[PDB]
Amino acid sequence: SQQVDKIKASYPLFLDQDYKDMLAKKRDGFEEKYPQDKIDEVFQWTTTKEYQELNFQREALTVNPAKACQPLGAVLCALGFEKTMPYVHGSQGCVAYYRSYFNRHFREPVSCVSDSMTEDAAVFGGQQNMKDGLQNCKATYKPDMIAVSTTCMAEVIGDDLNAFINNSKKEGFIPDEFPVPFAHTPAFVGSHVTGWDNMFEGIARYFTLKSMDDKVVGSNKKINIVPGFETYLGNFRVIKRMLSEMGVGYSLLSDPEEVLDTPADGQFRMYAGGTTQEEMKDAPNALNTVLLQPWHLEKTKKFVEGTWKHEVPKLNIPMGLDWTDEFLMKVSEISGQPIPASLTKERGRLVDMMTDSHTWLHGKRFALWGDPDFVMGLVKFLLELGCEPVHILCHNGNKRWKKAVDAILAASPYGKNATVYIGKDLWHLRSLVFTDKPDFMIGNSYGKFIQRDTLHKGKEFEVPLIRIGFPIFDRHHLHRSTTLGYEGAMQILTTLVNSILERLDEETRGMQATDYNHDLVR
Amino acid sequence: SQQVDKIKASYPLFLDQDYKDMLAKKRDGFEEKYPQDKIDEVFQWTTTKEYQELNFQREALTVNPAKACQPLGAVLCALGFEKTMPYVHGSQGCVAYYRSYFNRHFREPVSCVSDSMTEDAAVFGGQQNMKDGLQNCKATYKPDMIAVSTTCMAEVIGDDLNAFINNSKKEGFIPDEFPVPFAHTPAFVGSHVTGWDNMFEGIARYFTLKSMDDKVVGSNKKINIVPGFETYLGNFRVIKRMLSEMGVGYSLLSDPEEVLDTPADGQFRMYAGGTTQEEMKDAPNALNTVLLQPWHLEKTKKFVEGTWKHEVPKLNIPMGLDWTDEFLMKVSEISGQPIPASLTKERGRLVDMMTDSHTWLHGKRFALWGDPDFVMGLVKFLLELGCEPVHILCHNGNKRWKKAVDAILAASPYGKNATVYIGKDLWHLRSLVFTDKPDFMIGNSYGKFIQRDTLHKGKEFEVPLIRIGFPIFDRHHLHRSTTLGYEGAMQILTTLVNSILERLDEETRGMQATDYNHDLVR
Amino acid sequence: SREEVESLIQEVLEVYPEKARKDRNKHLAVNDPAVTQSKKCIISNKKSQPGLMTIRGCAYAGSKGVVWGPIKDMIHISHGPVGCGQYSRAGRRNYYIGTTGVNAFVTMNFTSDFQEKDIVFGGDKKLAKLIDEVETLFPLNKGISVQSECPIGLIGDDIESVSKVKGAELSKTIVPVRCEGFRGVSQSLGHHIANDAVRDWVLGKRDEDTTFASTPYDVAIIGDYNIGGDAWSSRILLEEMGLRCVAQWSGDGSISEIELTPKVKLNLVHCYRSMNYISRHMEEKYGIPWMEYNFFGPTKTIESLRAIAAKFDESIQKKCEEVIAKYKPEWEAVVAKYRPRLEGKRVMLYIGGLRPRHVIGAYEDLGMEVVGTGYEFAHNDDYDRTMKEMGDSTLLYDDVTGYEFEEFVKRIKPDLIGSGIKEKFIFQKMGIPFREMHSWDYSGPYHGFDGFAIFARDMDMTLNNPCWKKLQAPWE
Amino acid sequence: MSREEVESLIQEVLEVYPEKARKDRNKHLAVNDPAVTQSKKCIISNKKSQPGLMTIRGCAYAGSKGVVWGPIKDMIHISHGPVGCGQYSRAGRRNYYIGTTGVNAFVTMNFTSDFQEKDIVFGGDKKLAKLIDEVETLFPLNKGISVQSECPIGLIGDDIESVSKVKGAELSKTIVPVRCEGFRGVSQSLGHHIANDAVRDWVLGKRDEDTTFASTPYDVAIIGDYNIGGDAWSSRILLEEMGLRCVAQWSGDGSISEIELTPKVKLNLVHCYRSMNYISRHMEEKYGIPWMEYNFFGPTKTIESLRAIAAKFDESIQKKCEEVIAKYKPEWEAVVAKYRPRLEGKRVMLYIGGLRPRHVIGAYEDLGMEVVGTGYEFAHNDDYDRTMKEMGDSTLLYDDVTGYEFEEFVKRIKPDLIGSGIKEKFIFQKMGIPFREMHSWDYSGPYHGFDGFAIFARDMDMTLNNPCWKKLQAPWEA
């Protein structure tokens, strides 16, 4: 039933008595459901240390992964180039998913094509798909460049991307000079960040490998910036803003901020902004190259040092106070530009915010996850704030990374109760927040299901989620946020302390019970 | 008791059983408390339509006002000028309260002085306080200017500010060239915004009234901007950024953003930034003067039009989409600068955000309060988002203002169920939120006590607070936010839609009860 | 129209190369009432042209994301690399009642997370170990399905042998599903693969059992995936009409419900495309008749309630009219409020395999006109059903390309578009109100009388929203 | 560090003042000398603030409404006058209470007559009388009303005493007039006194002829604890564990009835001498009730106070006293073992109101810290007499310190920690000196008793050893 002037959506419509009795009869009648006390009993079991030990013995089963496959990263990297169409050689369903995944996080159009490889091509190869694919995409969506990656069926089959593209051009399907960089992106190797690295290195060597003879390091007086897999628009924006404030010349290599934030002004813009082919051709002439997320840009690093002869600085992701300081000082030394008053003051305003909020941040225990560079940057900043990063989980992390984070933890008293986990998923993390309860989770939207699980045990056990990372599907426009630099540290500090104070307000809202501590001033 | 490794603060320490039994014993023995059943009955009575009718019959009693007294705004206005010390002629308790009130909102030092008038100064005037006060202040805190307001005791006894200041100069307590603008700021007239208007007009007269002979309208090719009572740092900044993007020469009169955001770098800076005496002196040579908050700048307007001979344009506060459009189009006409591509895109990005989020905002019902200009801007923007501003309260609003807001409501389908209240306090508003329950409140920290009252009636009756306005004491660093322009509309939009979605997640977190609607994607 | 539409079709196709142009021409048609065989005017269920940005998914989406995933008390393994199960975790709102992680598992992502070692040596030993770990950690699961991702078939794995072996060892239902994404040309074959897996590994295991107490009014909702609650808003009506809905395939469905279906008297098929296969099997093996029905809007819902009631006796037919009389004032108030605000506005649709024709009636019940529609993966029998619901001279498009859709919208200029997430933000930027017709834009349900209220509210809130007035800056 | 150095710091700082202010402030700055025991030979206090020097002081309204009357939870307190005073003081002070706000308790609400110019020209007595009726209609469960006068009331000639007596008789309710106008006195201090006398004159004697209260040998009253963050509850719990019965708490979480029962107790336990010594002296002469001062800051002082209070009773209480001491002994020793190593040797400078500048010294010393400077906003000479006993030799004393002096003293002394108020906090944080609000406890607490020492120690450690303080200088500014 419905009241016309107060329409009910699924919630709370299905809480009306007649829907409840219907659902009760369906379950009792035909579902053959386990008794409720057996459900409550098994649930309690899943919150115990005993279950956790079984949970961490898993070898073959993954549950609720905190990572994606390589081609997702090759797509995002390609989208950062001017009028470039990402092209995933292989089966089409992959691309449907890649677009939907990014659609829901950015709430923007996301352009990507497949050559719709089929079980037939599994026998004689996808060569014909590439030839018709490239010619169709070029003529239909008129990109200036087509950046090719692969789905996992193409990798298994063994399609030689380089030869298929050369032949496409040889047989006339696309012009010889039309740029078609490529990268093999096997889903069964690494994760989505590896796909980013592979694509970018592929694009870099396409525009440079055979033209090194005329290159001179430093001749264009710029600094190459490689952002990596990055899904906050404000992180592309803050970097470019800080370098302009310093008078530093720079080339941001892979810049998707324009295309992922076009205005709604009556027309659709498939392409916007992005790194130019000519910035890439001229990149070897830079003073040097800075990798903003070095722990998933290893292949890129070998190419820029091996071919471009740049001496890539050892720098952590510019997150938090110290690592932003180090970033700006290394940029200053390379460029010969001093750090301007406007960044010195912004730095002090961050510190002022730190001193202002430290009493509510001190000792706060956190579980967190994400990609390796983002995770270690968050760990560093938490330690700078006096917080304790109790559970640190990076599904696509490795041993060398874990040793670096462990050393960061050991250099501070706020890391003494922290443990770093690699290769574990969000079902592992669920056990950790039950057996060693933190105060909050810092993670992506998949964390909302762990919060729900914790609340079900009891309100005293609930671990609220703070959404920082990727993907964020259940809040609007957080992709506009910033997490790098002083600006990003300011935003994270604000989100953290206010998440603490909002939760305190909830627990002290009880009239005559707990509202003695419901202070107006905090 | 305490366990040394998990120290409990007041919450939840006093929930321990020994404190609980102790408090129960205190109540039963010596408090002579009304029985709980009687307390419940009265509470439920305070939520009814009949209590509301008695509540709105009030004539003499005010409960939980939503405004402050004039000198508060005069102090804020004065802080906006270079190396200026605000100075309140009267009794010292006022200054301790003004500084503290701003201290807790901005989390920054707030410099202000009194001349400590006592019982003896009430019988013979505070002339001697003024003479020594001015000399003591100048010699001790070395300001380039002292802006003088009054407390209510100084107003009642009739201290002639102009004469006392002239006599301080003639008797040599401060140099005759030392700038000492003044304004009478009776607490029993208007509110804190009236004190801003009075102070600014006072400062404007001091630097321009006797020197109009050489001034030619439009000769410095700038536009003057008067911000009014403004407690968001982002609002000063966004106004200055947009005029800089437009290439429009301008002069912001009263600009406190620097002194209200100094860095923590090892030294305390009593003064910073602010508009210069040279700028106030040259302001008549501007093309025109734009009032950002005209509904509390009536006195400034009369002077600007009556003495400077500018024709202040009719512009609403630049909040939301239409009024920011109108602001920029009027600034373009006056300055001859075209609206640049970068502001056109930012506008289109705001409209994009409106289309991405309109589904969750539509029809949402709000109660809101604040100062007149801020409220009507919030009202206008909410109508543009498809929201219904059901309860609109402005304690310090007037009848002509209410007519303007009613005309805005009438011109939209989403104003059909809206009512504008003037002269009513937050105890009036509490009744409205029970009898005609909205979905959310938008207001300052004082609203947290109304949310607590609604929850105590029931979770299904709770009305969450969204913190926008002044003062915000119980969250950290929201004074850094923006509410003006496209940027402020974007921030407001994001806060509103994510407050809606955060509440939905709360109401659908119950496992096997309501989590069928606990969607990953929203 | 007619002439202007065919001229628009030729103009759009002039950008394609020869091969694609000649193929895409066969997938675009103008509806003509003196031509009722869709075969004589449009081709469908063909391979997608490479590199034209099709909207289609794959057979894994058709089987795991559509048919199997919603079954709530089973654990479904995304067998292969990590991507497939992550991108489709919780993306489809097939609602259900349960305790997630304990006895229900719909929004969780189980996967074997293939590494390169599994590509070289094979994943069958990994699968066997994975099943044991599932059993130890999720004891209350009632059966496992193994949803094959692209690599499984290509490397020669034998997931059927693992299923038979482990199923016998543990005495558990383990369903191998060969829905590798390279099979077929779209999600559609995944439906078929999925229907056959149900038939071969689940549906025949209570042929032996009679312990179920049957009634002459037992039915099954075949092909309702309870998007936003759509199936619950339909079940309620069928049970008010006096019927007993024994199972819901697969929206909020349990495996035991599925196993009970061969005992019903009538299979009520909502989604013909995804489930006609198993409906046809159940008629052959068990004698159960099946009928298509439509619960989008009051007109179609009333017609369907009466058509279903006519398959039973006078008592059901009487309760049918009782339900129609009960809800009459409710949807009439909805029309009385929202039709005036929507009448005369034109709509263009593009969706999957049923809704492009099924929701037309609901739009018409609000005075709206569907000037164009199309499917991602429909067959010709779908289009036969579509030619009857669409007006004369309307535009039809099969497996539409992003370019085609954009160009048609620019010339036709509809007041509203209803499509998917990959299309929503394109047309919002062009200034055209958009409503997702897959996920219901996180609203719904839209089925039944209670769903029509939300549908009408939703179309009105979007079409007439104040944001559409302000896309152009007053200075341009 | 040395006496000769601090004396030269004092005079060098005063070189900036005009001559008049110079001579006055020199009398409010002193350095402690263990040979001089009477403040009336070393420092003067409770004098008018000099104009224009940015004093930290409040007014008499703050001292009466803000600190004394406002915490009384089941009365309604009217900020009588223009809108300002009540709004700036709404919920600024954390005098915690149990109650149902808006129904039977009203502490964090702001009731006011919101004077307009009509009320200035015609007077507010007719307005006040109407307001009392409206309060009675909308807040029926209030157990009395106070009328806290703001600056204009006394200046325009209103007679709130008349309104109080008339309306109180008509409605049979306790209506208390308080002439605490902000221009009276020199600080909050006279607001304490005005408020104490208003309690005496209008509340305290209401049950002088009542004999229905059941007395015990162990009845006491906590006089001058305003339950900042629960401070009074974590003190009450100890007193009643020792076997006593706290009949009343003035005024933190206090009810009017508790106030009216206080003349029945056996002993008045005065925590804040400054604010409540007046009513304590009155109750000794009128009712014969003795009063003693005590200190519940830190384990050393709390143990000392417990034994002193127990010695006023019989052997059974003294036995339970040593039971409490032994019960909490392992808990506060754990706090020291963990936090003293982290704070010992650090130097503290204080500036607060009228009690804590001396009262919290023993707690800091219990954590090995050294209070090198302290001062009061509005203390009297008997407070400074008590301070010379608690303060070390050669430490700096400052009465009604100016913002300029406090900053200059900090620059020279360079203390590791500053404990003061909200108007000082953000000044010194920017200077890089850790700061802890010693009024509001920085929204932490309680700090009284043994449970409070655990929080206190935790709070000093988190702020003094916080990582933020080593980041103030940018690496490229060195």
Ligand code: ICS
């Ligand atoms: S199953 Fe099919 S594409 Fe019939 S694969 Fe698809 S939940 Fe669509 S038009 Mo998404 S044949 Fe269902 C469908 Fe229709 S996922 Fe849903 S909306 S009625």
Ligand code: CLF
């Ligand atoms: S068509 Fe369909 S979705 Fe595509 S893979 Fe194939 S089954 Fe799956 Fe999964 S893992 Fe990633 S996304 Fe592909 S590349 Fe290998």
Ligand code: CLF
């Ligand atoms: S010293 Fe003390 S606080 Fe000052 S007024 Fe006087 S009682 Fe009050 Fe209130 S309203 Fe505003 S702040 Fe003053 S100017 Fe009149």
Ligand SMILES: [Fe+3]
């Ligand atoms: Fe968008």
Ligand SMILES: [Fe+3]
């Ligand atoms: Fe600050």
